[PDB]
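Dataset card, provenance and construction

Sequences and ligand SMILES were collected as paired inputs. For each pair, a complete structure of the chain with the small molecule in place was predicted and serialized as structure tokens. The example below shows a pair involving zinc ion. Curators did not alter the output after generation; any descriptive sentences attached to a record were derived from the structure itself.
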Amino acid sequence: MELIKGQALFLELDKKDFLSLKNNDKNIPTFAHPKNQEKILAIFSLPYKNPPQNTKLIAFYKDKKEEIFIKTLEGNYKSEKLQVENKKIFPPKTIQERIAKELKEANAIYSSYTPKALFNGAFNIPLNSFITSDFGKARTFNEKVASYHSGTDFRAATGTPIYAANSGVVKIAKDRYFAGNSVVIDHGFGIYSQYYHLSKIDVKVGQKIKKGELIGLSGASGRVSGPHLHFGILAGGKQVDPLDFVSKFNAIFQLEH
Ligand SMILES: [Zn+2]
């Protein structure tokens, strides 16, 4: 198998007699295939930064042991230049305490695995506009700081209504230094959708949110070159190409009427 860095894969395995799926010493969680009752699924993601060159997964069965080899592909990501406020790439010392606390809070949330589906069928795109900055662009801020784009940006004037891409539970709903006003939704199975730089937040932590429900208004809060919506997906423990992930998820979990 081959996988571009920064993307997720849905691995399909036999359900009968399955015992565990591991990557080195790390157990990878599994969930039921919604269509095929003889199969289970697992999400495997490669990070954009510092992925391994190769991966060997091992699936253990009562009477089988299967090694699965995945080659990391570099992809064809391009570069872009952005101008932002200097304090958003070199934050004052008075602010680094908040940045560290916000980082620790987010790490805690993403390690809190929900072993059931909170979603309802396929994901929607949270905005009906167009991509202005695609996932994985290699970025330079102010000709000084290298970065990479960990989500996808959509055109949005300040005040554009933003709707939940799928049903789930709100885990973050507050102003953060870099992301600005942020909403993060747990959809189950380690899948989180992220909505950043908002001007207004319309949900609160712990809220059960349904697909298509208003979660806030787009803005220009946080580290920005101008107003837009940043949409992200964390899955398999990594930030992944969100629209690529949604296409792969929907191919499995979409429903009819
Ligand atoms: Zn972005």
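Derived descriptions for this record:
The first helix runs from residue 93 to 110.
The two ends are 34 Å apart (CA to CA).
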